[PDB]
Amino acid sequence: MVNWAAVVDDFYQELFKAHPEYQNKFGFKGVALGSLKGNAAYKTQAGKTVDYINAWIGGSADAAGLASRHKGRNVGSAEFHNAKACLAKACSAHGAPDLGHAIDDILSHL
Ligand code: HEM
After folding, report:
1. Would you state the torsion angle of the CA atoms of residues 103, 93, 18, 35, taken in this order, to the nearest 10 degrees?
2. Which helix (H) or strand (E) holds 34?
3. Going by CA atoms, what residue is nearest to atom 38 of ligand 1?
4. Which of 13, 15, 30, 57 has the most beta carbons within 10 angstroms of its beta carbon?
5. Residues contacting residue 68 through CB under 8 Å, at least 6 positions apart
C-alpha cells in the first residue's frame, strides 16, 4: 500500500520549512522539525491528515467540513495554495499519485 504516512510527514517538513509561522497554529508550536515525529500532538495531527487523504481517495472526504474548520483557524486559500505545492513535492518524493485535485476540492470551499 502507498506509504501515505511517510508522504504526510514529508508534506509537513516542506510546509513548515517554507512557512514556519504556520506551525504556530498547532499543538506542536516551537518543536524542531527533525523532532516532530517524537511529538504526541504532531502524531495525532499527522494521523488525521493521513485519514483525510485516505478518505478522499476512498470517495468519502468532507471537503466542505475541512474547509470550514480551517476557516475556523483563520487558514484560507493562500495557505492552501502554498500547501498544494508542498504536497506535490511530498508525493513526487515518494512516487505517489498527485493529490492536487484533493486540494482543489478544499479550495472550492475557501
Ligand atoms: C494538504 C492540505 C491540508 C490538509 C489535508 C489538512 C488536514 C487537516 C485535518 C484532517 C485536520 C483535523 C480536522 C479535524 O480534526 O476535524 C486539520 C486541522 C488543522 N489544520 Fe490542516 N490541513 C491542510 C493544510 C493546512 C495548512 C496549510 C494549515 C496552516 C496553518 C493548516 C492548519 C490547521 C490547523 C491549525 C488545524 C487544527 C489543529 C488542532 O486542532 O490543533 N492546515 N487539518
Report:
1. 110
2. none
3. 26
4. 15
5. 109
* Cβ of 79 less than 6 Å from ligand 1: yes
Query: Which is the CATH superfamily of the domain at 1-110?
Result: Globins (1.10.490.10)
User: By what method was this entry solved?
Assistant: X-ray
Distance CA 66, CA 72 (A): 10
Nearest Cα neighbor of 12 from 66, 48, 55 is: 48
The sign of the CA dihedral 64, 76, 79, 37 is: negative
Resolution (A): 1.6
Give the three cell numbers for residue 52.
483525510
Give the DSSP letter of residue 21: G
